[PDB]
Amino acid sequence: REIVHIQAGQCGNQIGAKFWEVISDEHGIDPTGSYHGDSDLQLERINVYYNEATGNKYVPRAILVDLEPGTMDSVRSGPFGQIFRPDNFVFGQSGAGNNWAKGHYTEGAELVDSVLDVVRKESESCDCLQGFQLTHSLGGGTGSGMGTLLISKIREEYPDRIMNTFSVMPSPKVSDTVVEPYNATLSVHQLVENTDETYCIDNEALYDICFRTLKLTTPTYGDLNHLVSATMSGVTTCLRFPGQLNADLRKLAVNMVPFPRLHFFMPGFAPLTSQYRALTVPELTQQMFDSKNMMAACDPRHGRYLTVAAIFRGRMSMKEVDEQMLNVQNKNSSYFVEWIPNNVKTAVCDIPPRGLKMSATFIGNSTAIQELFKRISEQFTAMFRRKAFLHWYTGEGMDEMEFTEAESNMNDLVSEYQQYQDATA
Amino acid sequence: MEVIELNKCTSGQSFEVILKPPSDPSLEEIQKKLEAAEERRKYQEAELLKHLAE
Amino acid sequence: MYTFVVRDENSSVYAEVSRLLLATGQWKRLRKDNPRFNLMLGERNRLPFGRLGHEPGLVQLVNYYRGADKLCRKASLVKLIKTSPELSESCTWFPESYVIYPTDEREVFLAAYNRRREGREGNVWIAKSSAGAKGEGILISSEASELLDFIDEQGQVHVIQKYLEKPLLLEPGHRKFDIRSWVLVDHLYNIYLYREGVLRTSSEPYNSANFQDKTCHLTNHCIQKEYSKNYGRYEEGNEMFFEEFNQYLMDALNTTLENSILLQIKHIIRSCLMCIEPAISTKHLHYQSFQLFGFDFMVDEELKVWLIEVNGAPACAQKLYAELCQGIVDVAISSVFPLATSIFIKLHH
């Protein structure tokens, strides 16, 4: 059951690279693609993310996309740069200048076809294609504009395959341009319609974590990507490593998404790292449920959990996890919907991430995620009620009403989230 | 409390003890409803592919 | 901390139990239908017993015993007594009683009726139900057929019980009374009797020939507080507690409350509750139960105690709500969910 990975834009490609650095090290594959590990468990589910090639080498099933060559020259340059099949580097030259319209309608359309040609050639070589995953930001132009364009094109060719994304949200605390709320609102509406799971990675939270708790005075995009790569690995371990779970992308979607449009998860991780003291299991669980470990800058206690999933990595007492997980639920049982019985599910995998003997990844589907969309929505209107900076978009063909609709669709989404937050049995 | 119908053999025995006495659809209409849900699916996929064409 | 829910809002007793548990600082109340609870204080009818004990990692406890209705509903009460060898046709503390349907005991009843008509015995009788609240649907005749047609007057079942002609009557007043005792059975089937009881007085003087009188005979708290002038003269609320009844018996009859009556009360309590112990005990079950019962007795003039009924959803006397509700927590609840002398007489078995 193979997965096809796509990374688009600067952010999309640099978190994407760190992801492949991390898991490639976990499965024991070196920067050349040659496996040199200690366990057979490292390779049993290696076909999920790796094509096996001539001469015992493993090449990620990954497609690298950008509308300018800048950072993908840097990817090819980086630690694991030469791991990727070079045919899968697909890029234009003009760049998208942080413009959703350029990525989705003009500059991106010129190149989208070339990308899906590589998609098809990875799919055709797939025993049974399970689904796609994308890494990208929503505040730029390529990852946002083109990224959502490819997703729409992939749903057209593969209408019955799962499409999940890792999506970086823009926050003023970590801002490139002022038009980010425009690009993110236009993308969210695309994600509402054509993705099964979207992991909301808020750059605000990633900043707060890096500065408040990790106590790093001036966080870099690198320091924020360490948190993303560790979470992306933690999430993907249900499939990357053999539990006695029969984990399937579709199956996991079915068990966490009670309503089609409400598929935006809050990620989390513990322990938060940048030390040697072994961390108790009771400490792992109380951290992952604390908002300070949330990658989405929302308080879980102003909403209610629709579904939850917790992944524990390491050698630990599966009886102590069951004990303390069922303990936290009652410290917070007011914050779990009562009309979805047994909506907190736990998984364990023996192999831990490199550097820590014990880790936990938190995947929450909370109605408190609306706080994120409300935040983006206010920044959006603040400028749109004055048509500020619209000329950058209307010059590429868009009309104001496409903006009005996109705004309306997410104000709808926020309303849908609060329907189920007040709802009771 | 009666014992009755005691049958035995080399593998075992059996009996009954009483303590007190007392006081389908077709083939064609299945594979039609399998087909009635196949078209409900192709109609939903058409409305999507129509939506994407818009 | 511990978790509990409340599904009987009109319950006077467990109202303060819930409030007293909240003041613990170690108990958290949840919404009526959240399933992740350690304790349920459930509705009186159709309590979903089958839904309990299936929540992983949560020991659940409930304030009612599935099957206890066979003791707390007068029709099955009678059936339990005459059908069970442990109690038997041969039961000296329960009045002669018959269940009659408007399985049926219609002519086994008149059989015993004219054997008394014959011999000039007291052919006193009364018919009853658990359906009629507020002393409704009662009928104390001396001839048999006047009630049988008042029985099938209505469409539900009524038991016919020998009425006690010679009750013991306190003085001053020549008044009748009944005794309510509160017994709590915890999860290990320990039988705890509350040391405090109540005499639910009648303030009328008793009149043999005049069974016309609604209030000359019937003693429960509402029929003398809204049907009788004399409510409150001799004692506050037509309620005499155990210290006064003891001293009165001492001064008046040269005996004790323990000796003359309480020994028989403790005998009847434990005889009834262990007759059914096999059918309701939650010893090895996935959920556990406790339940507070109200036992109602009557005393005839020979200082013999008779059992009149057992109530499953009982109300306390307002002076003791504090002491009783606190005892429930210590024994029935925190016994299972521990925290950071005794008011009960243990009836051993």
Added chain:
Amino acid sequence: MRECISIHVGQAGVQIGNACWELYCLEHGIQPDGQMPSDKTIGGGDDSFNTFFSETGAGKHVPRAVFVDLEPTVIDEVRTGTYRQLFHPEQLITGKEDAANNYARGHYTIGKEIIDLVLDRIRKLADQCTGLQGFLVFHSFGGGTGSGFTSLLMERLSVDYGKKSKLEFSIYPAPQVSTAVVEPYNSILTTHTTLEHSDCAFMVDNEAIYDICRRNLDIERPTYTNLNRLISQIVSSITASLRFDGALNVDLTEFQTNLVPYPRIHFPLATYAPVISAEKAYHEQLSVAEITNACFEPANQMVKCDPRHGKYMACCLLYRGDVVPKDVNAAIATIKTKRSIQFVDWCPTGFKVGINYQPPTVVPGGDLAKVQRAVCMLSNTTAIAEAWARLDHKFDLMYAKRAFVHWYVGEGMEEGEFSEAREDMAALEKDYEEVGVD
């Protein structure tokens, strides 16, 4: 002699089937190669063990079994396993992608593309049956294949084999060992469409097996392996009368006759004792009366309920190993005196009993200790309706908000099959109450 064919569906059905057939071989002296030294009728016969095994000219003894999953990961472990030689490839059927815990995906979408094939591989086994009895179908309530495809199969076996009996072994869902929250949906839909196609079903609440494994084997967190080897012991004692010389329940027809007066109410409660750990080096072996009275402790039941607050319709006792009729009556007499065992008035208050002298066989290296005598009791009590109530409630809660329904509609189902199926168990829940309260 009349043959019976077992069908194992989905992960739970397949893995359990693997555990049962393992035990059957140890019991009948069959080896992992299909060779039965003690069988002297080479390449043929009509013994009672031949009801579950066929024979080849080369002396191979082959289960009359069929495995079927919509994804190959689990049946692949059978094709590489210790008993790989036992089965032949046409009996093991695999799709490529599963039903993702979606009844609609298992029944409608992926179902129809594989239903004809399965039935073809089923008939390749019935064609070698001189006088076929029927089928024993293993499956979970919660899986999308286990629930969805089984109900489709059971529908067309009732037409392609209208006169043959069909018994179910069903795994009722428990959250302690399950990672899926839509299992209440799948169980309701499959029970509703399967109900008038199954003659008798034994349902096993994983919750009960779990706690039995924890209490009486002191395994802190049981695995599926722990659960299945215990489950197959129960299943083994239930089918032993078909595989061994005897006079009781020698035919799948007798199961409905002895245990099922009303057809809808065909879910007998199974209780089993004793369960003893193999780490308890040695143990004070329990009498007949001790194990027989253990059959009325809810803590040994396959579904947690309270049979004191229901009424019985039928009761079998299947002792294994070393028991004599007179020690049973001794026990039965003592139990009536101390237990609340009320029958429906329109049925006798009696116990059909069966004894086979071979003690329970147990897997070498398993977690279960060898015992001198064991019993499995089959009670058709109305108290099992508690399990339906629990399930139906969890269904009411989510469906009132239509949670997860879009997943089923997207695979072709209609929202009405939900309430149509829920209405059925509304009748089933009340059918039970009519029969067992006053």
